[PDB]
Every structure is written in C-alpha cells, then in structure tokens.
Design a protein around this motif. Structure first.
Motif, mmCIF file in Angstrom:
data_model
loop_
_atom_site.group_PDB
_atom_site.id
_atom_site.type_symbol
_atom_site.label_atom_id
_atom_site.label_comp_id
_atom_site.label_asym_id
_atom_site.label_seq_id
_atom_site.Cartn_x
_atom_site.Cartn_y
_atom_site.Cartn_z
ATOM 1 N N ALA A 86 -0.756 23.570 -19.721
ATOM 2 C CA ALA A 86 -0.735 23.853 -18.299
ATOM 3 C C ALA A 86 0.240 22.902 -17.635
ATOM 4 C CB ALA A 86 -2.124 23.678 -17.704
ATOM 5 N N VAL A 87 0.742 23.327 -16.486
ATOM 6 C CA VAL A 87 1.680 22.531 -15.728
ATOM 7 C C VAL A 87 1.077 22.309 -14.350
ATOM 8 C CG1 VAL A 87 4.039 22.379 -14.894
ATOM 9 C CG2 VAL A 87 3.538 23.644 -16.992
ATOM 10 N N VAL A 88 0.965 21.048 -13.943
ATOM 11 C CA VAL A 88 0.402 20.729 -12.636
ATOM 12 C C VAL A 88 1.227 19.645 -11.979
ATOM 13 C CG1 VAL A 88 -1.907 21.311 -13.391
ATOM 14 C CG2 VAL A 88 -1.107 18.962 -13.588
ATOM 15 N N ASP A 89 0.985 19.398 -10.697
ATOM 16 C CA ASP A 89 1.725 18.352 -9.999
ATOM 17 C C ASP A 89 1.088 16.996 -10.295
ATOM 18 O OD1 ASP A 89 3.618 20.075 -8.460
ATOM 19 O OD2 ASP A 89 1.783 20.736 -7.436
ATOM 20 N N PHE A 90 1.913 16.024 -10.666
ATOM 21 C CA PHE A 90 1.422 14.688 -10.971
ATOM 22 C C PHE A 90 0.460 14.246 -9.878
ATOM 23 C CE2 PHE A 90 1.047 10.927 -13.117
ATOM 24 C CZ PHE A 90 1.557 9.790 -12.490
ATOM 25 N N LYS A 91 0.729 14.699 -8.662
ATOM 26 C CA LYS A 91 -0.070 14.361 -7.498
ATOM 27 C C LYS A 91 -1.535 14.778 -7.622
ATOM 28 C CE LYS A 91 -0.669 12.676 -3.416
ATOM 29 N NZ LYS A 91 -0.046 13.367 -2.235
ATOM 30 N N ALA A 92 -1.783 15.853 -8.366
ATOM 31 C CA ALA A 92 -3.138 16.374 -8.560
ATOM 32 C C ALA A 92 -3.999 15.496 -9.482
ATOM 33 C CB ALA A 92 -3.063 17.789 -9.113
ATOM 34 N N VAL A 93 -3.342 14.656 -10.274
ATOM 35 C CA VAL A 93 -4.033 13.772 -11.191
ATOM 36 C C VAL A 93 -5.033 12.900 -10.433
ATOM 37 C CG1 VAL A 93 -3.733 11.829 -12.758
ATOM 38 C CG2 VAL A 93 -2.186 13.783 -12.860
ATOM 39 N N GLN A 94 -6.261 12.838 -10.948
ATOM 40 C CA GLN A 94 -7.323 12.065 -10.322
ATOM 41 C C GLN A 94 -7.495 10.683 -10.917
ATOM 42 O OE1 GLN A 94 -7.345 14.775 -7.845
ATOM 43 N NE2 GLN A 94 -8.860 13.141 -7.563
ATOM 44 N N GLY A 95 -7.005 10.497 -12.129
ATOM 45 C CA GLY A 95 -7.148 9.205 -12.757
ATOM 46 C C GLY A 95 -6.752 9.303 -14.206
ATOM 47 N N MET A 135 0.789 -1.224 0.000
ATOM 48 C CA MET A 135 0.000 0.000 0.000
ATOM 49 C C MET A 135 0.828 1.284 0.000
ATOM 50 S SD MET A 135 -3.247 1.126 2.331
ATOM 51 C CE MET A 135 -4.473 0.480 1.128
ATOM 52 N N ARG A 136 1.926 1.303 0.750
ATOM 53 C CA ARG A 136 2.779 2.488 0.801
ATOM 54 C C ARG A 136 3.478 2.694 -0.539
ATOM 55 N NH1 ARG A 136 5.318 -0.315 6.045
ATOM 56 N NH2 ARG A 136 3.825 0.337 7.663
ATOM 57 N N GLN A 137 3.927 1.596 -1.144
ATOM 58 C CA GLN A 137 4.621 1.638 -2.427
ATOM 59 C C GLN A 137 3.676 1.830 -3.599
ATOM 60 O OE1 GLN A 137 8.328 1.266 -3.248
ATOM 61 N NE2 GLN A 137 7.876 2.355 -1.337
ATOM 62 N N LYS A 138 2.445 1.367 -3.441
ATOM 63 C CA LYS A 138 1.452 1.495 -4.496
ATOM 64 C C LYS A 138 0.950 2.930 -4.571
ATOM 65 C CE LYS A 138 -2.853 -0.775 -6.032
ATOM 66 N NZ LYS A 138 -3.971 -1.657 -5.589
ATOM 67 N N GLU A 139 1.265 3.733 -3.557
ATOM 68 C CA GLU A 139 0.808 5.117 -3.531
ATOM 69 C C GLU A 139 1.896 6.185 -3.498
ATOM 70 O OE1 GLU A 139 -1.364 5.141 0.316
ATOM 71 O OE2 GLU A 139 0.028 6.791 0.771
ATOM 72 N N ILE A 140 3.046 5.897 -4.098
ATOM 73 C CA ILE A 140 4.129 6.875 -4.145
ATOM 74 C C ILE A 140 4.324 7.338 -5.583
ATOM 75 C CG2 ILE A 140 5.350 6.002 -2.121
ATOM 76 C CD1 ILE A 140 7.277 4.525 -4.019
ATOM 77 N N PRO A 141 3.711 8.476 -5.947
ATOM 78 C CA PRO A 141 3.883 8.947 -7.318
ATOM 79 C C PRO A 141 5.365 8.820 -7.635
ATOM 80 C CG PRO A 141 2.352 10.345 -6.192
ATOM 81 C CD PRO A 141 2.966 9.456 -5.136
ATOM 82 N N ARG A 142 5.695 8.033 -8.651
ATOM 83 C CA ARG A 142 7.091 7.837 -9.014
ATOM 84 C C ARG A 142 7.268 7.668 -10.516
ATOM 85 N NH1 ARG A 142 7.859 2.574 -9.814
ATOM 86 N NH2 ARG A 142 6.134 1.141 -9.324
ATOM 87 N N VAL A 143 8.207 8.411 -11.087
ATOM 88 C CA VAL A 143 8.478 8.330 -12.514
ATOM 89 C C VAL A 143 9.256 7.051 -12.791
ATOM 90 C CG1 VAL A 143 8.464 10.796 -12.904
ATOM 91 C CG2 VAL A 143 10.544 9.673 -12.117
ATOM 92 N N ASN A 189 -0.699 5.289 -7.711
ATOM 93 C CA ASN A 189 -1.875 4.571 -7.255
ATOM 94 C C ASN A 189 -2.205 3.286 -8.027
ATOM 95 O OD1 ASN A 189 -4.249 4.549 -5.480
ATOM 96 N ND2 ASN A 189 -5.381 4.916 -7.392
ATOM 97 N N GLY A 190 -1.177 2.600 -8.514
ATOM 98 C CA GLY A 190 -1.403 1.362 -9.237
ATOM 99 C C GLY A 190 -1.717 1.555 -10.703
ATOM 100 N N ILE A 191 -1.761 2.811 -11.130
ATOM 101 C CA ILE A 191 -2.050 3.121 -12.522
ATOM 102 C C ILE A 191 -0.820 3.707 -13.202
ATOM 103 C CG2 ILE A 191 -3.562 4.394 -14.098
ATOM 104 C CD1 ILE A 191 -4.932 2.189 -12.475
ATOM 105 N N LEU A 192 -0.513 3.189 -14.380
ATOM 106 C CA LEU A 192 0.627 3.625 -15.170
ATOM 107 C C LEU A 192 0.242 4.751 -16.142
ATOM 108 C CD1 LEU A 192 3.479 3.157 -16.452
ATOM 109 C CD2 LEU A 192 2.366 1.432 -17.899
ATOM 110 N N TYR A 193 0.891 5.907 -16.010
ATOM 111 C CA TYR A 193 0.610 7.049 -16.886
ATOM 112 C C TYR A 193 1.753 7.268 -17.869
ATOM 113 C CZ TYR A 193 -3.009 8.290 -13.452
ATOM 114 O OH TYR A 193 -4.091 8.298 -12.599
#
Ligand code: SFG
Ligand code: ZN
Ligand code: ZN
Ligand code: ZN
Ligand code: ZN
Length: 965
Positions: free
Chosen positions: A436-445, A289-297, A316-320
C-alpha cells in the motif's frame, strides 16, 4: 437522612506542615461529624418487610411503641453494611465536552502608549540588515536593558495587564524603536486560578516583536530557584530572602504549559554565541517545535524518472528508516480479504408478553441507538520505500513524502476473523506481500516488527522487554487463505544495552491491598519499603505480597506526627521512615465528605482542611520525594468546583514541585473494565516531570472522554492516541474464559484450574507458577429467590431483569415464587398487546400516593423495579449478565444484582462474578494474595488501582529516571 428510618447506623486536626497548613488556611474563612455507615437498600435483606413481631419492630411507632430504640427491624440486619466511599464516578458530568484549545492568552491587540521621550542609550552593538540592536533604551526617565521586565496594556479590558521580559532592543528602518517581548503568565491564568499567589508569574512559550511605544511601565521580576537544601526544607518554617522581594515583588519559579496543565522547571535551552544580546528562549523552543514537526526525508538512495527514494525520513522527533515498522490509521488501507457482511435476521416473530411482561421496557434503549464500539487497532506495515514525487520541473517534492509498505495482518484480519484473536498473543502478526502507498504524514508512530524465529531470545522476553513490539512466524496469503513460511526478504538484516537503574524506595499511603505498588513494582522503578493502610484485612494482604515491607495499620496522621516530633520507631516497635528514606511517595486518599460538585462551604471546607488529602500533601511536603503520585476517582478533578484539584496543585507549586494532572481510562491499558482515574504527578526540581501513558489498547469511545474543565478552561494530557491504539481491546472472554465452572456460594479457597490458559491475557495472569493453584474463585451465596432469578436471565447478549418470565417457581428452600400482578393502569407505558395493565402501584396514577398494600413479595420479577422503573431509565443493567465480547463496569466492591453500580451476573453461569474473576478484571496476577472473608476480598480487589494501569504510569516515571544525568 430525615431521621432513623430503619437505619442501623454504624484529634480531628490533620497532621500538617506549616507550609501546607498556611496554603489551606487562606480559603473559605469561618468569620463573616464522624462517618456513618449506611445500608445498601438492595440486598434481599433490606428488601425484607418489617415483620412486626420482634423487640425491634415492636419498639417502634408502627407496631405500638415509642420511637426510643431507633434500632431497625431485626430481620433487616444488612450484611452489606458499608461506608459511602467517594469512589463513585457515578455522575458522568462531562459526557458532552464542547470546547476548544486554550487560545494563546496574549493573542490580541495592545494599547499604544504616548511616552513622550524614547531615545537609545549608547551605541548600536550590531547591524543585521535593517536591524541595529542596542543594549539600553531610555523612556521618559525610565531605563531598560535586555533582561528587564515591562508591562503592556491589552486593548480589551476583559483581559489582564501583560508582563513581559525584554529579550532584545533594536531599531528597524521600517518599524521604528522595537523590542522583543517574552510574555509571562499570571497565576490566575493557569489551572490554579484565584488560588495562586497574586505575585507569582510563570514562564510560557509566548512572545512577539513590538514597538517600544507599547511599553506601559517597568516592573521588577525576581527568579525564585530551589535552595541548595530544597529536599531538607520540608517542615521548616516559611522563610524569605526579603520582604520587598518575595513579599511585595513579582516573582516566578516555574514554566507552564497551558494545554496540558504542566508546571515545569525553567528550560535550559542555550544561545548560540550569535545572539547573547537578542536571545529568546521562547523563540528558540518554538523554532524547535516547528522543525521537530515537519515530515522531512533525509539521505537519498536513488533518483528515478518520476520520484526520488530516500533511506530514511523523520517526523515528530522520530527517525523512520526503510525496513522499520510503522503504525497507520485503520483508514490507511484495506486488506485483500473481504470483510464479510452478514444478512437476514430472526425468522420474524415478536416476544410473548404474557410470559415476558417487563420486556417492552427495552424499546427505549434500542431506538435510542447503541453506543459506539471500540475502534480498530492500528494498521501495521513495514516500510518498503520512502519516496517523494517530482516537481513540475525535475526536482523532488518534499512537501509531499510518501511510503510504500507491506501490509501486516492481525489474526482477526484474516478469513478466520475475530475468533482468531481469542488465543493469539496480542502482538502476533502475519507477514504479507500485499502493498500500500500512504502519505508519510498519516504515520502514527514507529514500531518494531520482527520475524520470531530469528530473535536472540524467546518471544515472551522480547514482548515484555519494550514498547511497541510485534512479531510474526508465518505469512498469510489472502488469495488461497493459507499459511506459509515467510519469504527471505521479510527477515533481518545506535543500539546499546538495557541499563537498569536501582529501584526507588517507595512509601505508599492508603495502600489498600497493593494494586498501585504491584504495578509500580512491575514497571521496575520501585520497592515499596513502607505502607500505610488503616483497614486491617487490606493491610494484611499488602504484607502477604510484599514480605520485605513495613506495613503500618494506623491512621496516616499519627505516624507523620511521630516522625515530625523526632520519633524513630512506633509503639508497635516498627521503624518509621525519615527524610532521605523516601524517594517516591504514592497513594490514593479517600475524599469522603466532599464528593459533591457544589461549591465549598465555610463548614464543609473546615473539614476538607483536615481531610486525608491535606494529610497526604503534608507527607509529600515533609519527605520531599523525587516523584509524587496521587491517584483518585475521575471526579477528583471536579469535586467542589474543582477547588479540591486547584488547592492540591497550588500546594505542590508552593513546595517548588513540578506538577501536572490528567485523567486515564484503565481499559486503554489492558483490562476488560471501564474505570477512569484522576492522576496528579509531581516531580522534584531537578527531575524530569513524567508524561501520562499513551494508550495501549483501543477501548469504547464513550468511556474515553479524558478532558477536564476547570473554571471554563479545557485541559487535556499529552496523550496523542485518540482514535486507535496498538492492541485490540481485552474482553470478558480474555479475562475469565479459562476459569472452572463454580456455583452460587462457592467457598473452596483453593481449587484446580482444571485446564490450560486460553487467552494471551490468561497466560500473563496465571504466571509461571510451578504448582499452579487457582485461588479465591469463590462467590457470594445468593438467597434461593435471587438464585432463581439469575438462572432465568437469558444468556443472550444484554439480557437483564427485563427479560425475566412472569411465572410461578418453586425455590431451593421449598417456598413458591408467585407471579407479579399488574394491578394499576400506567397511562404512560400503556397496556400490553393482549391488554394487560403495566402498573404495580397507585403512583402510576395522577399524582396519587403509594397504597402500602400494593407492594408484592417473592415474585420472580422484583416488584420494586417496575414500581420505580419509569424514573430510572427502566433500571437497565440490573440482574444483567456480562457479555463475553464486552467489559466489566468499574469493578464492584460488593457485587449485588439490584445494586445501582451492579451489572454482575456471570456470562453463562447462574451466579454473580467470583472474587478471582473480579481480580482478573483488575489485572491482578493470579498469584496475588488477598486476605479476609469473601466480602473483605471483594472490597480489596475493587478499591485497588489496576496493576496494568499503574505499570503504564510507572514506565513513564522510569523514562524520567533514565533521562536524569
Ligand atoms: N486515615 C486513613 N489512614 C490510612 N488508610 C486509610 C485511611 N482512610 C482510609 N484508608 C484506606 O485507604 C484505602 C483507599 C483505597 N481506595 C486505595 C487503594 C490503592 N491505591 C490500591 O491500589 O490498592 C483503603 O484501603 C482504606 O481502608
Ligand atoms: Zn443491604
Ligand atoms: Zn421486626
Ligand atoms: Zn521570542
Ligand atoms: Zn408507588
């Protein structure tokens, strides 16, 4: 009721299995009544005053006679006679949820014990740094190996005794003789509360290192897995491996999620062959859970002067990946197009109170402020770049991942504004060169946004084909406010196919006309082969829409008794479903009789004990289907101090089912209607417990309070979309703007649509019918007086009875409607500007009674409304019109202008909503057949579960079917 005040009032043991019966028999011991139809005191008949000139009134006390024939006046034969359906979420007993998240129970100080002898048994088996692990340990006589369970004492007595499994035994050169404790959770700490087995425990992801000195005692805890024949054990008699075991020893069978009230089969997580002597499933999962939720490139594609770009990132388990679609909060960015702000107002002029005497009753609403409007749906944008800044040295900062995107425009986002949404597909977008430039963290899905012309299939197939799918055909230039073809860099360029598992044979109990089954079928997971609906009209309708199904028009209790006795067919010659035949069981049992919040009674429970809820659970137990679905009114979770909800879960847990519960708002799934439903999901031991459907459309916040409180614990579902959603809300306009104008009393069962669909919603509901026929666009025929009232309600948004003009009016029948006379001075509401009184009875006085002669009749403005107005918030909504930009209220079962639950006048036409319009508000395809008289059809539509809602839920079950290996 006190007596039979003009009242026209119109074995008992439920069929149960020994398991279900015994679960419910334990409660509310008796050792220290059939449903009666009431009349809606609202229709123009109930309003009628006892004439006193017929066998009825002449046989009562008032008009010289004996109170023998309780029969009410003959001029009061209520056409809307009805049973009080518990489908009344009319309580809003959770409009102010002030609570947090369930604090990890075992969070707290424990008491160190003074065991006088703790010595390792055997030799170490490892030496990881300062830790030397042992296989066994011996304390004052007792012995412990990993896998054994212990008990620790909390420091606070307001906390229960803790039970844990020892997953490790080691000695730290810095802390002493340790051990790892994987906490269990006692049944009374779950939603079950005191209804659970005192010996049952559940697994939870809670653990912590601890000194062996904190161990209070050793305890036995056995695992109770489902037998080889779990699915056939339904109905059998309560067995037992041993008495000292399941009879007197702690046991467990399921895992538990406290935040979501989810009971699930034990996790299978595997131990790397490096910790077979120190493995803790909890840590394993918590680590995931901790690793599945660390926005990481991930992989990088360039190293520049101030930042390094990556091709993809995971959150969050989703690949962007670059080029992908992403959901952003409406705050993420603005559009170049300036959101226009209106100015000025009416050219100053108050309302004429002589003409509109009941309009002042609107000030309380106004000042009280207006309720929040639905949020903006998600901002959508294409990932152009994924980059990390640069540390104060030269290395990329990963604690800060950013994304540069292309802003996509929704039709309503352009200069055309909101009107642009009326005819547009809900998933239509416009490309844009705005960035626009935003923080990856703001991404909802993540979402898919494709250029429509390059798709391998048509837009419709692509849209009905998968979640979060959007498309565009043109680009939008804000500067020139023009539409041009999209650039080429806006086009494309492990994807396999669309596996289609077979449908599950489904038994739908209390099927009604079929809403729930329709949505399930639409999700492509089921085939309702068997249905049970005791009310004939609705049962006929289910037949019409499901030619291949077997509809039982009888008490659900008789059929179950037959199959249990061995019968294979019934008196009518129908084939009864047998174990193995039912793969899925769904239904919505009525809760009439125990719809109150007040605690259960010894008597009130003996009846619930035989209610349709117990019967439904009996079906579930006996057939042991793969997936179980119980839908009901939101308040199902609260009735009787939540005992109804706890006993239902308790009974499922006892069956060995995985189960959870949640509350959903229908409006969040595509309908312009407010309607919250309680949902209990259960799934077989070898299945994946479904999740609740993530909202699809933004909807009014006040209507989306989904949380639930049981015994002071707050529960929520897995739903993460709490502010925005993918699609704009569906309005009344989306629902019926295309319907041909009809009149009060419309009865033509089949007319022309006389035009093309207008909204995306309409396009979906009219379907691909060869020879399109607009059915059931009929509506109740209101009295000449009621009709007159309706045509005098302004079309302005939010108009209701308080807007009626106090004027004399000739009626369609010929009689004249007199003016309402203000006879008494209501000191609370004062006088009108001109000096007119506002009271209409003596009661507006100092405690005074009601002078029976003060009542007035046939007045445009109903006398009764100002009469009791001050004690019902001015009856806001009565004779009110739906607003094109708004939504329906919980679709009424029998539209009445003065009906509490009723805000039912058409937006512009002077009539109440038609049967078809009501079916539109429920999300029923226009081709869905109804059966019976107009009042019967309304009932059908209104009692049903909206298909869009059931479809959403169905897709969650589909995911589980596809996941089963
Ligand atoms: N004892 C009973 N046996 C079978 N059906 C019953 C019984 N009591 C009530 N009903 C029916 O249960 C239904 C409850 C509905 N509110 C359910 C609607 C359903 N979920 C739908 O989507 O259409 C009604 O159609 C009732 O007439
Ligand atoms: Zn009535
Ligand atoms: Zn009479
Ligand atoms: Zn652990
Ligand atoms: Zn009065």
């Amino acid at each position: 009721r006190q007596t039979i005040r003009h009242s026209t009032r119109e074995p008992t043991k439920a069929t149960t299995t020994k398991l279900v019966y015994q679960i419910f028999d334990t409660f509310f011991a008796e050792q220290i009544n059939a449903f009666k139809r009431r009349r809606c005191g609202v229709c123009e008949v109930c309003q009628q005053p006892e004439c006193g000139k017929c066998k009825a009134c002449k046989d009562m006390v008032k008009f010289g006679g004996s109170g023998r024939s309780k029969q009410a006046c003959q001029e009061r034969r209520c056409p809307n006679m009805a049973m009080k359906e518990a489908d009344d979420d009319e309580e809003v007993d959770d409009n102010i949820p002030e609570m947090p998240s369930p604090k990890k129970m075992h969070q707290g100080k424990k008491k160190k014990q003074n065991k006088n002898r703790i010595s390792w048994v055997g030799e170490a088996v490892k030496t990881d740094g300062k830790k030397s692990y042992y296989k066994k340990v011996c304390i004052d006589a007792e012995t412990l190996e990993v896998g054994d369970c212990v008990s620790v004492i909390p420091d606070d007595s307001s906390k229960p005794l803790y039970l844990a499994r020892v997953t490790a035994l080691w000695e730290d050169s810095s802390n002493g003789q340790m051990f790892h404790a994987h906490w269990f959770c006692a049944g009374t700490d779950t939603v079950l509360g005191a209804t659970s087995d005192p010996l049952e425990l559940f697994l939870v992801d809670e653990c912590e290192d601890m000194q062996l000195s904190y161990i209070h005692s050793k305890v036995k805890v056995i695992y109770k897995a489902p037998s080889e024949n779990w699915a056939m054990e339904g109905g059998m008699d309560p067995e037992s491996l041993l008495e000292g075991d399941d009879g007197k020893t702690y046991f467990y069978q399921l895992w538990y999620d406290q935040d979501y009230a989810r009971f699930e089969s034990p996790p299978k997580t595997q131990p790397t062959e490096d910790n077979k002597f120190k493995f803790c499933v909890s840590c394993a999962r918590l680590a995931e859970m901790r690793q599945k939720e660390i926005p990481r490139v991930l992989e990088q594609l360039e190293d520049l002067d101030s930042r390094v770009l990556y091709y993809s990132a995971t959150k969050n388990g989703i690949l962007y990946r670059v080029g992908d679609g992403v959901y952003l909060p409406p705050e993420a960015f603005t559009f170049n197009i300036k959101l226009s702000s209106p100015v000025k107002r009416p050219r100053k002029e108050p309302v004429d109170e002589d003409l509109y005497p009941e309009h002042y009753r609107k000030y309380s609403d106004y000042i009280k402020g207006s309720n929040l409007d639905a949020p903006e749906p998600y901002r959508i944008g294409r990932i152009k770049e994924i980059f990390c800044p640069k540390k104060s040295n030269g290395r990329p900062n990963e604690t800060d991942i950013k994304i540069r995107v292309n802003k996509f425009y929704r039709p309503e986002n352009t200069h055309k504004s909101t009107p642009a949404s009326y005819h547009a597909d809900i998933n239509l977008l416009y490309w844009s060169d705005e960035e626009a430039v935003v923080d990856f963290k703001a991404v909802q899905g993540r979402c898919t946004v494709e250029y429509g012309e390059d798709l391998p299939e048509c837009v419709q197939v692509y849209s009905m084909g998968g979640p979060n799918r959007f498309y565009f055909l043109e680009a939008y230039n804000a500067k020139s406010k023009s539409f041009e073809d999209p650039p080429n860099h806006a086009r494309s360029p492990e994807p396999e196919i669309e596996i289609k598992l077979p449908k599950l044979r489904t038994l739908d109990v209390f099927s009604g006309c079929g809403g729930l089954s329709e949505g399930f079928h639409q999700a492509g997971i089921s085939d309702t082969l068997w249905a049970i609906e005791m009310w004939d009209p609705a049962a006929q309708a289910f037949r019409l829409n499901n030619p291949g199904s077997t509809v039982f028009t009888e008490d659900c209790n008789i059929l179950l008794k037959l199959v249990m006795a061995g019968e294979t067919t019934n008196s009518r010659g129908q084939r009864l479903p047998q174990k193995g035949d039912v793969e899925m069981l769904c239904g919505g049992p009525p809760c009439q009789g125990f719809s109150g919040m007040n605690r259960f009674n010894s008597r009130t429970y003996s009846k619930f004990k035989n209610s349709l809820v117990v019967s439904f659970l009996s079906y579930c137990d006996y057939y042991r289907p793969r997936f179980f679905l119980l839908e009901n009114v939101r308040n199902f979770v609260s009735f009787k101090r939540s005992m109804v909800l706890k006993l239902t879960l308790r009974c499922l847990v006892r069956m060995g089912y995985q189960c959870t519960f949640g509350v959903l708002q229908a409006g969040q799934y595509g309908v312009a209607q407010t309607r919250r439903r309680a949902i209990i999901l259960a799934a077989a031991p070898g299945e994946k417990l479904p999740l609740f459907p993530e909202p699809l459309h933004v909807f009014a916040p006040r209507a989306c309070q989904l949380s639930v409180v049981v015994d002071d614990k707050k529960f929520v579902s897995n739903i993460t979309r709490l502010s925005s959603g993918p699609f704009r809300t569906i309005t009344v306009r989306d629902t019926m703007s295309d319907l041909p104008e009809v009149r009060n009393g419309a009865s033509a069962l089949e007319i022309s649509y006389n035009g093309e669909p207008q909204s995306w919603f309409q396009r979906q509901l009219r379907g691909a019918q060869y020879q399109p026929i607009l059915r059931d666009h009929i509506c109740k025929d209101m009295s000449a007086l009621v009709a007159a009232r309706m045509r005098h309600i302004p079309l302005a948004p939010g108009s209701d009875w308080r807007d009626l003009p106090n004027i004399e009016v000739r009626l369609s029948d010929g009689t004249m409607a007199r003016k309402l006379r203000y006879t008494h001075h209501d000191r609370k509401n004062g006088r009108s500007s001109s000096g007119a009184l506002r009271g209409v009875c003596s009661c507006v006085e100092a405690g005074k009674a009601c002078d029976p002669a003060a009542r007035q009749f046939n007045t445009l403005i109903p006398w009764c409304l100002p009469h009791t107005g001050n004690r019902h918030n001015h009856w806001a909504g009565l004779y009110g019109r739906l607003e094109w930009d708004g939504f329906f209220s919980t679709t009424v079962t029998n539209p009445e202008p003065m009906g509490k639950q009723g805000r039912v006048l058409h937006p512009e036409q002077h009539r109440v909503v038609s049967v078809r319009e009501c079916a539109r508000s429920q999300g029923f395809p226009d081709t869905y057949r109804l059966f019976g008289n107009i009042l019967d059809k309304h009932r059908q539509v209104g009692n049903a579960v909206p298909p869009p809602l059931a479809k959403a839920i169905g897709l969650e079950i589909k995911l589980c079917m596809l996941a089963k290996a």
